[PDB]
Write a protein that binds this ligand. Sequence first.
Ligand SMILES: Cc1cc2nc3c(=O)[nH]c(=O)nc-3n(C[C@H](O)[C@H](O)[C@H](O)COP(=O)(O)O)c2cc1C
Ligand SMILES: [Mg+2]
Length: 399
Amino acid sequence: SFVKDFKPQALGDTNLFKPIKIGNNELLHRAVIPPLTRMRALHPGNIPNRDWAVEYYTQRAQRPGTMIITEGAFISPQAGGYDNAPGVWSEEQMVEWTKIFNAIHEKKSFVWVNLWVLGWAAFPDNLARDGLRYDSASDNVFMDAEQEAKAKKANNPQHSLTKDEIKQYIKEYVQAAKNSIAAGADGVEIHSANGYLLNQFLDPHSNTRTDEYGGSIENRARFTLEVVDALVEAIGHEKVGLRLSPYGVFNSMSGGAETGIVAQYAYVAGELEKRAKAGKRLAFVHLVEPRVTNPFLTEGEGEYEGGSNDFVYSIWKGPVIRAGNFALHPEVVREEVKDKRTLIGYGRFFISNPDLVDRLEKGLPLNKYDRDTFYQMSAHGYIDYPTYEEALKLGWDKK
Ligand SMILES: Cc1cc2nc3c(=O)[nH]c(=O)nc-3n(C[C@H](O)[C@H](O)[C@H](O)COP(=O)(O)O)c2cc1C
Ligand SMILES: [Mg+2]
């Protein structure tokens, strides 16, 4: 079952296949695997699937020199909220993560742990059960209707983080980052996009605070930057990444509707480039394409014609990973990669194609992804996707 009506194009002759260096890693191509939640972690314990996780990542580390940003990992119990998402706070979890990283490194690929904190995107009932607060930037604005419904049902109102709680969250980022490197992770990517906690602070719609963590560009960017400054000093700026989704409106973020959103983000990028001067330039900056403001929806629905991230290029001088609907558009990838410091993140199709990189370099048919197994406790739709050879022998081309 390959994708029809799609005319592939060999990209082997573009820079997509030219070696670049990110942090301490020396990639052999520039097609990256962005953080993809698959929800196969175990419960209780948010334990990395002791059965399929290793095989899954291994299958996608097959192409040597692949930079793999793992699926979102909770830094601690409070930062979580989804029973089947993995974490990087306990020993039990670190024992399973170490096995995955060795599988990845063994295939001569790299791995970067994405540090995840759901904020208001977390299920409140799940938090009330473990005795956890329902965190967020404020208490008078909720994600949406179904959420303020669960918040009340479990009498777990949306709590507005105080100063000491952010510091506690910042203590956990350093520990999650440390444990990650301790086990052989090539680095860590601070997840500050798609409407999760940090993003909830960056966004003016979700951030109605008055203190130094709200009330202005400077203040709404305070949290994310303290985390940046925290992990940089603890593990080394060459082991830290940052993800942002300027025009994303996922998890009820402002997006391009807010006029000063571009200022909110140009500020952040400038501060990175600032530290980039003190000799402390984060390994990279990962951006979710405006083309994709909602990670969870059809392939084409939800974009912005009056907004682009090309502005970050005018401020940030380090590498840039751009992610969002690129597999079925090699014409756009061919052009976007003429920039010597731009990598490309493929999500949906790395899920369906374990040997994606080879299929880009040669212009071969892409495996269709099954939307129903994105988040499912199963191997089917997780690790049984065929490689180009396996798909052929199976007559996937419908002869
Ligand atoms: C099943 C699935 C899970 C995802 N999980 C996450 C996540 O945990 N964090 C995140 O920031 N983005 C997440 N994304 C968005 C991806 O990082 C990526 O930006 C998105 O797939 C857009 O690229 P694509 O259109 O080429 O797939 C997810 C996407 C999918 C399809
Ligand atoms: Mg045959």
